[PDB]
Amino acid sequence: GSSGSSGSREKSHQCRECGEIFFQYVSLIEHQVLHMGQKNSGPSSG
Ligand SMILES: [Zn+2]
């Protein structure tokens, strides 16, 4: 019944999607993007 978490407790950042643990929020929020996106950037793209 809404139990498990006790006061302030470190929160890990796992991506069930693939299964990777990170520390910096940016790593996750950013990583998520990697998943989406295909056939967009080809050869000599800049
Ligand atoms: Zn992932």
Side-chain angles (χ1 to χ4, degrees), residues 15 17-20 31-32 35:
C15 177
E17 210 77 297
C18 48
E20 181 156 33
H31 154 83
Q32 279 288 327
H35 280 319

Side-chain angles (χ1 to χ4, degrees), residues 2-28:
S2 297
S3 305
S5 306
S6 307
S8 166
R9 284 282 181 162
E10 275 78 37
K11 304 165 281 274
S12 308
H13 286 303
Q14 196 197 1
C15 177
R16 205 179 276 172
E17 210 77 297
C18 48
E20 181 156 33
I21 302 165
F22 294 107
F23 271 90
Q24 287 150 340
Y25 186 61
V26 177
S27 193
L28 180 71

